[PDB]
Amino acid sequence: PRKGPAPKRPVMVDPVYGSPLVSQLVSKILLDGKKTVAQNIVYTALEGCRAKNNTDPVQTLKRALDNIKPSLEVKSRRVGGATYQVPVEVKPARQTTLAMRWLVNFSRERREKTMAERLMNEILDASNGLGASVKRREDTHKMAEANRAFAHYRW
Amino acid sequence: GQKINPHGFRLGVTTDHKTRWYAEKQYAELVGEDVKIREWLHKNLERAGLSSIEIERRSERVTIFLYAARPGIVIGRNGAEAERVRGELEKLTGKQIQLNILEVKSPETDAQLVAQGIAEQLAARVAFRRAMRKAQQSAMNAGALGIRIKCSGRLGGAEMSRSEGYREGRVPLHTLRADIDYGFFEARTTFGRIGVKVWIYKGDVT
RNA sequence: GCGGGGUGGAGCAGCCUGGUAGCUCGUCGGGCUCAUAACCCGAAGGUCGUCGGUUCAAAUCCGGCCCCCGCAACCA
RNA sequence: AAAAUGUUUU
RNA sequence: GAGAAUGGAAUUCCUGGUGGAGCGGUGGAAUGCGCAGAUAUCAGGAGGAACACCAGUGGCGAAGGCGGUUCUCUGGGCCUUUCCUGACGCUGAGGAGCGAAAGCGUGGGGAGCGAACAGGCUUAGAUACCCUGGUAGUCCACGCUGUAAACGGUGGGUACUAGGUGUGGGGUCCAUUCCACGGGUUCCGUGCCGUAGCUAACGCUUUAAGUACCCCGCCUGGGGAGUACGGCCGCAAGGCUAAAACUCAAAGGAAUUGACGGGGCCCCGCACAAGCGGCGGAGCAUGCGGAUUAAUUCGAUGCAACGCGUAGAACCUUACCUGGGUUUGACAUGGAUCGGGAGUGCUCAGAGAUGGGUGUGCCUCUUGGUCGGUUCACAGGUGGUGCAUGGCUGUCGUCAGCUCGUGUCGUGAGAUGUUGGGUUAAGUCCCGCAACGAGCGCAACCCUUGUUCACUGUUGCCAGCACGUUAUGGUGGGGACUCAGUGGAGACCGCCGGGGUCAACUCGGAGGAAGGUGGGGAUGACGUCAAGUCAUCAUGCCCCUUAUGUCCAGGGCUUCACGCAUGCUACAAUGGCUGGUACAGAGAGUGGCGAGCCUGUGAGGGUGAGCGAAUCUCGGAAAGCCGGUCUCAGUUCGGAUUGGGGUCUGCAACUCGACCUCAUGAAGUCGGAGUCGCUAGUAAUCGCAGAUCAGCAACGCUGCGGUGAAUACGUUCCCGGGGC
RNA sequence: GGCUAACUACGUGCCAGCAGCCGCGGUGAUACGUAGGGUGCGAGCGUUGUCCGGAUUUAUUGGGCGUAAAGGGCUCGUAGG
Numbered sequence A: 001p002r003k004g005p006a007p008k009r010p011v012m013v014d015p016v017y018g019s020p021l022v023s024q025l026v027s028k029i030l031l032d033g034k035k036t037v038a039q040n041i042v043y044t045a046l047e048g049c050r051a052k053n054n055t056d057p058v059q060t061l062k063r064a065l066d067n068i069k070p071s072l073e074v075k076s077r078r079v080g081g082a083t084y085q086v087p088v089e090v091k092p093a094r095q096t097t098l099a100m101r102w103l104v105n106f107s108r109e110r111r112e113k114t115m116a117e118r119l120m121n122e123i124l125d126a127s128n129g130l131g132a133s134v135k136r137r138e139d140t141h142k143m144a145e146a147n148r149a150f151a152h153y154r155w
Numbered sequence B: 001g002q003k004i005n006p007h008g009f010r011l012g013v014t015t016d017h018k019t020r021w022y023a024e025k026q027y028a029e030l031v032g033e034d035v036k037i038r039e040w041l042h043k044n045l046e047r048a049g050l051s052s053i054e055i056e057r058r059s060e061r062v063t064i065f066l067y068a069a070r071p072g073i074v075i076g077r078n079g080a081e082a083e084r085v086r087g088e089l090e091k092l093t094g095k096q097i098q099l100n101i102l103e104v105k106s107p108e109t110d111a112q113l114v115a116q117g118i119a120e121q122l123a124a125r126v127a128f129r130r131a132m133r134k135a136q137q138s139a140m141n142a143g144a145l146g147i148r149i150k151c152s153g154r155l156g157g158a159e160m161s162r163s164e165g166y167r168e169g170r171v172p173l174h175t176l177r178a179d180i181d182y183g184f185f186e187a188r189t190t191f192g193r194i195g196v197k198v199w200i201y202k203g204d205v206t
Numbered sequence C: 001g002c003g004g005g006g007u008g009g010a011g012c013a014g015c016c017u018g019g020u021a022g023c024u025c026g027u028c029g030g031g032c033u034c035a036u037a038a039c040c041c042g043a044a045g046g047u048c049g050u051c052g053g054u055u056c057a058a059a060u061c062c063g064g065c066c067c068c069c070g071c072a073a074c075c076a
Numbered sequence D: 001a002a003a004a005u006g007u008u009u010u
Numbered sequence E: 001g002a003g004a005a006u007g008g009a010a011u012u013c014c015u016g017g018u019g020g021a022g023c024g025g026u027g028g029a030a031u032g033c034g035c036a037g038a039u040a041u042c043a044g045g046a047g048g049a050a051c052a053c054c055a056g057u058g059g060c061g062a063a064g065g066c067g068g069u070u071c072u073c074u075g076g077g078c079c080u081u082u083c084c085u086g087a088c089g090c091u092g093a094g095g096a097g098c099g100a101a102a103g104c105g106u107g108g109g110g111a112g113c114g115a116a117c118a119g120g121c122u123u124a125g126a127u128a129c130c131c132u133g134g135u136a137g138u139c140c141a142c143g144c145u146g147u148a149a150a151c152g153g154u155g156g157g158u159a160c161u162a163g164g165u166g167u168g169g170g171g172u173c174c175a176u177u178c179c180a181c182g183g184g185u186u187c188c189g190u191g192c193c194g195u196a197g198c199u200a201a202c203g204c205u206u207u208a209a210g211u212a213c214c215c216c217g218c219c220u221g222g223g224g225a226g227u228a229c230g231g232c233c234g235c236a237a238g239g240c241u242a243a244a245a246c247u248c249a250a251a252g253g254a255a256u257u258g259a260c261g262g263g264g265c266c267c268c269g270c271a272c273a274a275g276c277g278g279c280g281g282a283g284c285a286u287g288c289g290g291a292u293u294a295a296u297u298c299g300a301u302g303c304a305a306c307g308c309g310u311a312g313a314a315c316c317u318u319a320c321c322u323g324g325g326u327u328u329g330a331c332a333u334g335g336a337u338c339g340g341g342a343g344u345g346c347u348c349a350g351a352g353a354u355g356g357g358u359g360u361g362c363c364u365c366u367u368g369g370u371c372g373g374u375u376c377a378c379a380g381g382u383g384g385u386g387c388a389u390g391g392c393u394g395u396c397g398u399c400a401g402c403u404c405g406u407g408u409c410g411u412g413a414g415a416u417g418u419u420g421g422g423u424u425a426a427g428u429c430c431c432g433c434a435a436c437g438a439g440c441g442c443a444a445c446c447c448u449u450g451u452u453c454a455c456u457g458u459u460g461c462c463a464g465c466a467c468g469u470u471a472u473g474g475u476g477g478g479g480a481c482u483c484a485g486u487g488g489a490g491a492c493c494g495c496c497g498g499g500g501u502c503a504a505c506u507c508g509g510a511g512g513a514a515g516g517u518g519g520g521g522a523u524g525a526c527g528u529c530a531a532g533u534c535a536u537c538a539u540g541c542c543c544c545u546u547a548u549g550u551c552c553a554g555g556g557c558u559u560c561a562c563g564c565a566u567g568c569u570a571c572a573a574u575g576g577c578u579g580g581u582a583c584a585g586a587g588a589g590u591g592g593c594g595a596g597c598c599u600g601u602g603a604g605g606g607u608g609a610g611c612g613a614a615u616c617u618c619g620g621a622a623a624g625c626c627g628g629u630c631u632c633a634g635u636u637c638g639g640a641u642u643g644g645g646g647u648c649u650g651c652a653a654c655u656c657g658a659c660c661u662c663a664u665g666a667a668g669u670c671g672g673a674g675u676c677g678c679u680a681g682u683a684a685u686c687g688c689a690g691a692u693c694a695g696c697a698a699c700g701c702u703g704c705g706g707u708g709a710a711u712a713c714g715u716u717c718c719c720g721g722g723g724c
Numbered sequence F: 001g002g003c004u005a006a007c008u009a010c011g012u013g014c015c016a017g018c019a020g021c022c023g024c025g026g027u028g029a030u031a032c033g034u035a036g037g038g039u040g041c042g043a044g045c046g047u048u049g050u051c052c053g054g055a056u057u058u059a060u061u062g063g064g065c066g067u068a069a070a071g072g073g074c075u076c077g078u079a080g081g
Ligand SMILES: CON(C)Cc1ccc(O)c2c1C[C@H]1C[C@H]3[C@H](N(C)C)C(O)=C(C(N)=O)C(=O)[C@@]3(O)C(O)=C1C2=O
Pocket: D009, E301, E387, E531
C-alpha cells in the first residue's frame, strides 16, 4: 500500500514435527478454511514420506523446498511502447512462499487419486530433483537467464 | 437530501420520546389512536400554534400535554373550547382523556413555532428574506447560540425552485451532546407549498 | 463469329481433374466506452445464371439458353 | 509511441 | 563590408591492408545494406560544405544581418584638452537605394543536408509524425524577385524628471608602484532592479510606454479583403496600389475565478501490484430489455436501473384486460326533508356484485343518538406534469473540504486569511506569515466489542454444606466462579529513551486486557447531477365525472425464437453415501411456539402438556472428529427435466404454491474475450434466526455465530480523488 | 419588460404574432391578441423617409498607434514643415 509495509503475522510451528515449514504447508493447502482436513492431508503425506524413505519427513520436505526455491524471477515492465521481462532477485521469504505454492499446486495437478499422497509423491520427487515443481523452477530460472540483459532496470 | 433528523439522531441520547406508555398486545392500535389524536389536533388547532403533543397512558386513560404558544385559542372562553376539544377527543378515541395545555416560555426560541411563524408569513406573502431575517434576529435577541433557517420551494411565487437559507452563530448538527431543537412547517401558498426548516442551538447538555 | 466471365451481402479463390466450397470485408450475438467509431472474442451465411446430357457421383465435364465483357465484322 | 468523435429539446 | 590566398577536424566517396556475419534503424520493427566480404579497423587519396574550443550575461552594423586564419581594399562609431568653420540643424510626402530565407534566369559545383518522390512502419485510413533511400535546392559567379512574428509587435531628433547594481569602449586622477593590482571621476554604449509619473490591466520607468516641442508613417467595428476591377513592377511565382455589394452585433485587449489537460511536483483509496476466491461456459432461481398478448399495471436505465419500490402477486394485494353491476356514488363533511329502526340471522336467484324473501327489531323524549331517500352542497382518481413543488433518498464522498465578519491589496471582478516549511487518517496540529477571527465539515460527546470493580441473585450460576428414585442446582442454601444489567474505573503519546532548531509529530520500550484512532456502527460539510420518487404521503396547475369514479367474477402481472444482470447448485475423492459422536451465537412465540406418546416410508395426521416466556417451545446447530463404504467411472459426481402416488395451507393450488415419496437421471470434465470481491477473525466456506407471511416460488434481504487463510517488494502503469 | 412616464386578467401555446436594440412566444406571457385600469400627448397622435445631435465614432476646439484597429523592413534624400 501507499502508507508502508504492512505488518506480517507471525508463523506458528507444527505441534507434531516442531517446524514452521509444516505449518506453512498446511496453511497453504488449507482449502475452504478446513484446517483439520488440510493438516490430516499433510500429516498423511509426511508419514508416507517417512514410510518410503527412512529419512525424516521434515528433512525431506526441506530438501524439496530447497530444490523448488527460485533464485530470481522476471516481472513485467512498462518501459517504452513494449513490455519487458526484468529479472529480479527473490528474497528468502518470497522464494519459500513460491516453492510452497508451486509444490501445492502441482500436487493438486498430479494424476494420482488422493491429495494426501499426490502431495507425498510430489514431495519425494522434488526432493530427489524431479517433478513438475522442479521443472517450473528450472523454466523460470531459464527465462530469467534469457532476459538477464535487463538486470540494470532494477530500482 | 442526505441529512438526518436532529431529533431522531439525538433521540435517547439527549432528547426524549413524545409518547410514554408500555403495551405489548395493542401496541399497534394505541399507535393508531395516537396518530388520530395528533392529526386531529394539528388539523383543528393551527391557530394556537402547536410546539408538541405529548401522550401518556396508564390504564385505558390517555393524558395529552399540548405545548402551545398561545393557549388562548385552545381554552376559548372559560375553558369552553378546552371542554369541546376534550369531548371531541373522547368521541374520536373512546377513552378517558385528561388534557392539559402548557405554555412555551420562549416561542421565539422554540424552532417549531419559529417555522410556524415563517410559514404563516410566507403564506401571507411576505418577502422571504425579510421573514427569515426577522426570525433570526428575534432568536438571537432571545439568546439562542445559533440559528439556521432554510426555505425551499417556489419562493416568491417563481417558477424555478430555490433553497434560500440564513444562519449565524453556531449550529453543530454533528455533535450529539449539542442541544439542537428542530422544527419544520409548510407554507401553503397559491403556488404549491414552501418547506421551512429551522435549527436552533439551545446550548450544550450532558 | 472467336475467346473469357456468372460461386454467401459485396469484391475475389475452388475448373489439367469430379468426392474437402476458401480469404478479405460486411451481416448478426457478446466484450471494451459515458456513448459511437475503432479494436477483442464467438456464429450464421452461396446445394454454384438457367435447361439438358455424360457419369456411381458435376461449381468442375459437354451442349443449348440468358446476362456481362473483349475481339472481329475486312478488299472495291 | 501512435490512440478519433459528441445533431434539433423546451 | 568586399576581394584573394590559405588552415585543421569531421562526413562521404575512392584505393589498399586486416578481418568475418551481420550492419543499420526504432516505441517495436521492417524497408535497406552485407560472404560478389558489409559494419568495423588502419594507411593513402579525392572532393564539397561548414568553421569545435575562444563564444556569452559579449562586440559590430541603418536595418536585413555579421564568427577558421592571413593579406589587400574600404565604411561607420567612441574619446580628448587645446584647434577650425560659425546654426551650416531636425525631419522628410513623392523618389531612390539597401533588404533573412524561399523562389527565378544563365553557367558552374554538389560532400553533408534535404521539399518533391519511392519504399518500410504506425493506423479504421496515414497523400503525416517515425525509418531507409532521395531530385531540385542548400554552394559559387552574374542578374532578377523585394517579401518575413523584416518584432523591442515600441519612427526619427531634442530637453528635462529618484536611485541601486552588473557589463563593453575611450580618457583622466590617486596611493603603493614608478608596471599593474586597486579604487575613484568623466564621456559613450549595453542589461537588471526600482521611485515619481503613466497605463484598461499586463507592465513601462533616464535605453519611457513619464513631462514636453518639431517632422514623418499610420488607425476609425468584425468578416467580405489586402480580395475583385484598373494600373504599375516582374522571365515567372507573384508584389505594390486598392474597393463595393452583401453579412454579423459583435470582433477584440489584459486580467480574475473555475473546470480540464495524452503539464509538473506532492499525496491518498483493494486503484494497481502481491495474493485468495469468483463471475463470463452448464442447469435452475430472480430482475430487466425485447418480442408476444385482450392485459402481459406502473416506476427504476452508465458508475449511482436491473434478488431495485416488492420486508411475500393463486383470490385479495391490483393499480391491468374481458365481461357483468352501480351513479351524492365504495368512503367523508354539512344543511334541509320524510322517518323509525339501523344493522343483521335463515332462505331464494346469481360467477359474484347485487336483487327478492323471512325472522328480529332504536335509546331519550314531544324535542337527541341512528339511518333512509330526494336532492343540495359535494365526494372520488395509483389520471397528467419529479423540468411547478414540499418531504424523503441516491450520488460524487468518510472525500478534506466549503465559507464568513473585520482588516488589508487591487479601478474592478477578485485576493489575502485558506500561500509557504513540517506533520497528520483529517483545513489534524506546529512554524513562519497582512492578516486577525469565527462557522459548517475532521475529531470528541452516542451505540457495540475487548479488561476490571462495586451492586443485585431469578426464570441465571454451583466453589464449600445437607439430600435427592438411580438419575435432573431437582432440593435447602450460597455471592465464590459464569452470566444477566445498572453505575464506576481504564488509554491520555500519560511514563522512559531517541529523532524532531525546538514544535507539532515520529521511532523504540515499560506497564497493561488493550498503544499511538484498539475493532465496528451511528453520524454524510457548501454543493453537484432540472439525479429518483405526483405510486408512501402532501401539493400548484391541467384533465375524468351514468366515467380516467366505484363494486364483482374470471384473466394478467408467472407469456418465450431470444439478450443482459444478480444469485444458487454443480462439474466430484480436501469428495459422495452411511452409522456414531462433539462445540454456538443471535433471535421468535397465544388464530402463536409446541414438547411427549401413538400412527405413517415420509411430508404429515391424531391426541396433546408447557410457555406471553433467562423458566416452555422452536432445538437439530452444520462444517468437524471417528468407523464403514464407494475407487476416478459422465460415476454411488451432478439433480435438471419428466411420469405416478400423496400431504398441508386456503372459499380455491388449471393457469400459478410449497413439501413428501416412487421412478426418470439432462447439461456440466472448471468455463472465450473480458470482468468482480476482499488487507484479519477479513476472504473462503458452514449452518442458524428474523422481517413480510394462511401458505410460499426465500437460492432474496437484514442479522448471528462456527471453521478460518494467502499476500501487500512497492507507486512505474490502470481507475477515482486531494493540496499547490 | 428595460432604456421610458404608465399592469393586471382572459385567450393563445416557438403557433398566431411582436420588436428600435436587448429580446418575447415551448402552458401562470406585466413583451403576442382582447378587456379593465393606467401614462404620455391632444385637434391632433403615431409610422416611414431625410438631416444634425447624442458620436471625443475624423478628436482645430477634442482621440489615438507595446499587447485592443494603428510605426513604413531600413536608410539616404527632393519639395515642404
Ligand atoms: C426528455 O425531455 N427533455 C428532452 C429533457 C427533460 C425534460 C424534463 C425532464 O423531467 C427530464 C428531461 C431529460 C431526461 C434525461 C434523463 C435520462 N435518463 C432517463 C436515462 C438521462 O440520460 C439522465 C442521466 N443519465 O443523468 C437524466 O438526467 C434524466 O434522467 C432526466 O433527469 C430527464 C428528465 O426527467
